[PDB]
């Protein structure tokens, strides 16, 4: 009782922890009350308690600063003891830690400690260590004297003193600038997967020493450079306390025969001596390249030594080996055999939300102006990875630094804290840096949750419900794991796949004709397996194969070369589908405009068992389509959307969109010409109607209706 398991914080503030309200009710303490936390080695800390909707009933959420003061780690247990007797302090003496005050001078109180404590009413205990961010530096301080003891609340009338040399850090204390879980932005799911596999044997080694069954021996992290492969490996070691050994291909390969293999096996011996430990091998493709690609003895023997060292892990208890590569198929396949590195995680590329989180992490120490909009930056930085967003923040800082330092002209060994305190980075400095930055991951496919929702699709009310039932039924109550859409082009086939992914918050993987053709043309259809493996790693996701017949058409379609309806890629797709279970949380959607010439195997039981026809929108749907397309623009009251829909009897949704964009373009041109009108008027739609035409003929509709009746 009165004890909770230590978990991660949501509020990064160093003076507060969050409990689930039922435990605050049992302890009869209110939001804002001051409590003591009892940790290991007879240590304690004082903090304020709040509550939220996410903390588990049996856990306490506290950040790294609080855990370090208690000398506890995630997964430990502490006691909560309210201390309402705490009073306000009269004088507190705070001095910085030497490890963070180097190259910087000036009045640290005025820049850091004063605004940090001013009207904050933070609890303080003698010996506490805390971090104050600012001036592009992270400076932490320790409390060395308190007039009240052993703790108090700082007040606006409390004297804050700071005179003396910086304090040297203790050997049992870690720097707050060391990478931890709070430094990782996107790829939260991948981090959780590592936690499940790694933290248990490191925090509770007794569970695995008592039994003959070993935990996973190696984890292969793959994805583009700069996505956090090494950051995760280090953060996990730093949070659990396991010794981290850094290895990389070039460091071993640069050595001569004998020295190379010796250094590799020596590191493994050190890990056992320092167990629990994690061995991280970067550039696995460099240390263990495929043997058929080299004739050197050094490269082959190093692979042999690594293979035996991985096998020896059954004796080196509590040592886990992790490795990083660009692709799981770029390394010697022997490492991926049962055991060794038979577990892998796809890190991928952060989406717009993850990129914003990464920027917010990098700017923690940066003073930003009110005009800076990091969300807008994250939306524009498509194809960037955390390594590029770090460069972006650095370049934006450097541009701001140059602008002021040219006028400050302070030439000395250290920089004044005051001049850094007044230095702010504006939107013009990020805009400049964006123009100079170039994404390192622009060639790889970016997979994220789409922004298309059901309100963006006109008509097809029954298809919307069908897709919602197909995904909801296996969750609320063999269910099908895929659907084929057929019908005229420009009716929303792709939008339907995106909208269901949107509402489910699922990743949308878009495969288009050119990609299916690229695999066929280059005889690289084996890449389909990687696409399906990505779908599993991206789960929950929707795996959308558009233009299924793009290859059959490229080979002739109505005429034909050496092939027919089946090809290299569709046969690989059929093969991979047979290996995917309904429990993989992947929904496969296909689309074609010519269902009569697609390999019918795709509709056979166990594959795309659902089959939905998408007709042209009817009158009420066409109005809904026009309203959806115009939902983002001012439209005059004289625009009669029902009149337009009545005329556009044979038009597809894509054709109605062209009409909307035509009227939009005309409204913009008129406004520009008048300045050198503020809303789209009927005259702009009536002009668009003179050029817009239906793209789907009546004969094409009969083709689809006959197919639908043939299959029922």
């Amino acid at each position: 009782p009165n004890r909770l398991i230590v978990d991660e914080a949501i509020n990064e503030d160093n003076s507060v922890v969050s409990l689930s309200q039922p435990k605050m009710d049992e302890l009869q303490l209110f939001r804002g009350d001051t409590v003591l936390l009892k940790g290991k080695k007879r240590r304690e800390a004082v903090c304020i308690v709040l509550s939220d909707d996410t903390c588990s009933d049996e856990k306490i959420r506290m950040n790294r600063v609080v855990r370090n003061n208690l000398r506890v780690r995630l997964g430990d247990v502490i006691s909560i003891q309210p201390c309402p007797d705490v009073k306000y302090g009269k004088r507190i003496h705070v001095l910085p830690i030497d490890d963070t005050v180097e190259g910087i001078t000036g009045n640290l109180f005025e820049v850091y400690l004063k605004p940090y404590f001013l009207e904050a009413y933070r609890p303080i205990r003698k010996g506490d260590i805390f971090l104050v961010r600012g001036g592009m530096r992270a400076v932490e301080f320790k409390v060395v004297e308190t007039d009240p003891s052993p703790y108090c609340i700082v007040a606006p009338d409390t004297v804050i003193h700071c005179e003396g040399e910086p304090i040297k850090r203790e050997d049992e204390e870690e720097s707050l600038n060391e990478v931890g879980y709070d430094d990782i932005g996107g790829c939260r799911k991948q981090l959780a997967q590592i936690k499940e596999m790694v933290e248990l044997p490191l925090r509770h080694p007794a569970l695995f020493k008592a039994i003959g069954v070993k935990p996973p021996r190696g984890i292969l992290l793959y994805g583009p450079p700069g996505t956090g492969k090494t950051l995760i490996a280090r953060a996990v070691a730093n949070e659990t306390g396991a010794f981290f050994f850094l290895i990389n291909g070039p460091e071993i390969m640069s050595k001569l025969a004998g020295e190379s293999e010796s250094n590799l096996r020596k590191a493994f011996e050190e890990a056992e001596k320092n167990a629990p430990a994690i061995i991280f091998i970067d550039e696995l493709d460099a240390i263990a390249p495929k043997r058929e690609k080299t004739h050197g003895e050094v490269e082959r023997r190093i692979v042999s030594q690594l293979l035996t060292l991985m096998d020896g892990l059954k004796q080196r208890a509590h040592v886990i080996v992790m490795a990083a590569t660009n692709r799981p198929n770029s390394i010697d396949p022997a490492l991926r055999r049962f055991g060794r590195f038979d577990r892998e995680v796809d890190i991928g590329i952060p989406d717009a939300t993850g990129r914003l989180e990464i920027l917010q992490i990098h700017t923690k120490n940066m003073k930003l102006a009110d005009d800076v909009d990091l969300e807008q930056v994250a939306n524009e930085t498509h194809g960037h990875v955390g390594a590029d967003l770090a460069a972006l923040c650095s370049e934006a800082a450097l541009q701001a630094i140059r602008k002021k330092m040219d006028l400050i002209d302070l030439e000395d060994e250290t920089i004044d804290a005051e001049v850094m305190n007044s230095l702010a980075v504006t939107m013009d400095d990020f805009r400049w840096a964006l123009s100079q930055s170039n994404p390192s991951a622009l060639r790889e496919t970016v997979v994220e949750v789409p922004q298309v929702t059901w309100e963006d699709i006109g008509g097809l009310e029954d298809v919307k419900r069908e897709l919602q039932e197909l995904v909801q039924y296996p969750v609320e109550h063999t269910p099908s794991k895929g659907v084929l859409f057929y019908g005229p082009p420009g009716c929303g086939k792709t939008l339907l796949a995106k909208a269901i992914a949107n509402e489910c918050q699922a990743n949308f993987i878009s495969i288009k004709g050119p990609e299916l053709l690229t695999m066929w043309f280059g005889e690289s259809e084996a890449n389909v397996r990687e696409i399906f493996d990505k779908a599993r790693q991206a789960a929950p996701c929707v795996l959308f194969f558009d233009e299924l017949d793009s290859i059959a058409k490229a080979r002739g379609g109505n005429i034909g070369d050496g092939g027919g309806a089946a090809d290299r890629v569709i046969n690989q797709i059929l093969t991979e589908m047979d290996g995917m279970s309904t429990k993989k949380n992947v929904f496969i959607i296909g689309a074609t405009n010519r269902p009569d010439i697609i390999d019918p195997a795709i509709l056979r039981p166990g594959r795309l068992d659902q089959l939905i026809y998408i007709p042209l929108p009817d009158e009420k749907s066409r109005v809904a389509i026009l309203k959806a397309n115009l939902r983002k623009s001012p439209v005059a009251k004289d625009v009669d959307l029902e009149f337009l829909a009545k005329m556009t009897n044979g038009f597809s949704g894509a054709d109605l969109t062209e009409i909307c964009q035509r009227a939009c373009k005309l409204a913009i041109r008129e406004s520009i010409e008048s300045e050198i009108v503020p809303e789209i008027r009927r005259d702009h739609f009536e002009e668009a109607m003179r050029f817009a035409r239906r793209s789907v003929s009546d004969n094409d509709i009969r083709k689809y209706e006959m197919f639908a009746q043939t299959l029922q």
């Binding site: 398991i5 007797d85 799911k189 959780a192 248990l200 509770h204 995904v471 909801q472 489910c504």
Partner: protein
């Protein structure tokens, strides 16, 4: 009310920080369930049914 400084003076049992099989299995089960919940493909209606339980 007047707080009493004596309310803050308490010493924990030596076995306090030694977690049991139920406490360790519960945490590892929640770790596996948390990864599974992130993997689940579900509609907004199922998501709200769970979230709404705390209101």
């Amino acid at each position: 009310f007047q707080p009493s400084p004596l309310a803050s003076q308490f010493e924990l049992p030596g076995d306090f920080f030694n977690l049991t099989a139920e406490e360790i299995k519960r945490e590892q089960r929640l770790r596996s369930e948390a990864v599974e919940r992130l993997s689940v493909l579900r509609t907004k209606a199922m998501r709200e049914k769970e979230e709404q339980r705390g209101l």
